[PDB]
Amino acid sequence: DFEEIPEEYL
Amino acid sequence: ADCGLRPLFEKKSLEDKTERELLESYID
Amino acid sequence: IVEGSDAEIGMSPWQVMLFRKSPQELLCGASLISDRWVLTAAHCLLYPPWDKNFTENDLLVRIGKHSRTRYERNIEKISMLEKIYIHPRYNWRENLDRDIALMKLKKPVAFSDYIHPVCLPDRETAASLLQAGYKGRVTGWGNLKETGQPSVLQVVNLPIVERPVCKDSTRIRITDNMFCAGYKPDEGKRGDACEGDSGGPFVMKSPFNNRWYQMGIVSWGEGCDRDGKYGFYTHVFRLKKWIQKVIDQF
Ligand SMILES: N=C(N)c1ccc(CNC(=O)[C@@H]2CCCN2C(=O)CNC2CCCC2)cc1
Ligand SMILES: *[C@@H]1O[C@H](CO)[C@@H](O)[C@H](O)[C@H]1NC(C)=O
Ligand code: NA
Ligand code: NA
Predict the structure, then answer these.
(1) Residue C163 contacts B where some CB pair is shorter than 8 Å
(2) How buried is C61 (Cβ within 10 angstroms: 0-12 exposed, 13-18 middle, 19+ buried)?
(3) For C23, which DSSP code?
(4) How many angstroms separate the CA atoms of C187 and C43, rounded?
(5) C4, C11, C110, C206: which has the highest count of C-beta atoms within 10 A?
(6) Cβ of residue C47 lying under 6 Å from some atom of ligand 1
(7) Superfamily, domain B1-28
(8) For the domain that residue C199 is a member of, what is the CATH number?
(9) N- to C-terminal Cα distance for chain A?
C-alpha cells in the first residue's frame, strides 16, 4: 500500500 | 562523465557486498 | 526480483521508480542516465494487448528511492514528464524486439548521495563486457516470486548466457537486440527479475575504469526464476544510435 506523496506532485 | 561513480561507494573508495562477485566473473 | 537480496543504501543511485498517479501504484522500473533523461522499457508505457498506453500526465518518476511504498522525505525527488519517446520499431506485436523508451524530465533533477546517473556503454564497453559467464546486476521493486512485494529495493547478480542456450530455452523468436541472463539448473544458484521489475536496468561494473554501465533493460521472461528459463533484456548498446538521435534532437 502506497503512502500519500506531497500534493505539489499532484 | 561522472556517470557510474556512486557517491557512497566509488566516490569514497568503498565497495558494496557483492561487486567483487561481478569482478571475479570478468576473467579477461 | 526473485531470490535476490535487499540492496544497500545508495547501491543503485540510478534507480528510478515509474509511478502511477491514480491509482497510486508502481508502474515499472527505469534508470537515470542524465539529469534530464530517464530510460525504461517501451512496454512499460505501450502494450496494446493489455490496453496499456500511458501518456506524460499519467505518471511520475521517483528518484533516490529505497523503500517501495514509503514517501522518502528529504531523500527522493519526484519528477514530472515533459515528453515520452518510444522506439519507432518497437515490436509489441510479436516479441518485444526493441523494448526501449526514453523519457524527458520537465526540470533537471539534482544529484545527491542517493541520486546519480549510470553510464551507457560504447562499442568497446559492450564488446569487453557482454560475454557469456560475465555477471551483471539487476535491481527492482517487483514481485518477490512468480506467484509478495518487498519492503525495500532488491538486487541480484546474474551471469550472461550464451545465445544458443537462450534460444533453446524458448519458443519465442530472439533478436540481436536482446540477451538473456540467469543461472542454469546445473549451477545451483538462483535469481531472476519478475513483474514490477520491468524497465529497470541490468548493469555491470567495468574492471577497466571501474564505472557502472547499463548493458540491459528488464524486458520479459517465461514465469520468474523458472528452472531452464532465462530473463530477457533489451540490448542497450545495440540501440545506442537511437538513444543519441533522440537526445541529439530533443
Ligand atoms: N523472467 C523475468 N526476468 C521477467 C518476466 C516478466 C517481465 C515483465 N514483462 C512482460 O511480461 C512483457 C511485457 C508485455 C509482454 N510481456 C510478456 O512477457 C509476454 N510474454 C512476452 C510477450 C513478448 C515475448 C514474450 C519481466 C521480466
Ligand atoms: C496510444 O495512445 C495514444 C493516445 O493515448 C494514441 O494516439 C495512440 O494511437 C495509441 N496507440 C498507439 C499504438 O500508439
Ligand atoms: Na527455440
Ligand atoms: Na531460470
Answers:
(1) no
(2) buried
(3) T
(4) 31
(5) C4
(6) yes
(7) Thrombin light chain domain (4.10.140.10)
(8) 2.40.10.10
(9) 18
